[PDB]
Amino acid sequence: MKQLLIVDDQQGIRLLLNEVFKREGYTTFLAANGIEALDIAERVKPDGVLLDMKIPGMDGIEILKRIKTRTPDVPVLMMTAYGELDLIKEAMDLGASHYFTKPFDIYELRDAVNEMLRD
């Protein structure tokens, strides 16, 4: 239906979030790093992006800047550990639509994503 790009270097989290959003009946794209995320975002033009804060090499803040530059109206929702307070503040200052604290609440994930691109 709608296209969700899910970006995290962690296989278990990619698969968990894939499961949550495939069950909500979304079309999903998985990326393990910024290169894959930006190549997919350029070709697929997804309806939304779930973006991990901490990714080796190009981290979630540098990915967010590159997504919000090319396509400023795509909602980007961050995924973060609960004490990356300064990264949460920077991502929100840079126009992130939401952030989710780990450990993820499955109901929060479903509901916030459904609201941010389902009417």
Binding residues for Mg ion (CB under 5 A): 9, 52, 54
Residue of this chain nearest to Mg ion (CB atom):
52
Nearer to Mg ion, 45 or 85 (CB): 85
**46 CB-contact burial (10 Å; exposed 0-12 / middle 13-18 / buried 19+):** buried
Least Å distance, CB 73 to Mg ion, is 26
Nearer to Mg ion, 2 or 54 (CB): 54
Alpha carbon distance 30, 95 (integer Å): 22
Nearer to Mg ion, 54 or 65 (CB): 54
Least Å distance, CB 118 to Mg ion, is 26
Least Å distance, CB 46 to Mg ion, is 19
Least Å distance, CB 2 to Mg ion, is 24
Alpha carbon distance 59, 61 (integer Å): 6
**80 CB-contact burial (10 Å; exposed 0-12 / middle 13-18 / buried 19+):** buried
Nearer to Mg ion, 101 or 114 (CB): 101
Longest dimension (CA), the chain: 35
Q: Which tokens in the block code for residue 53?
A: 């804060």
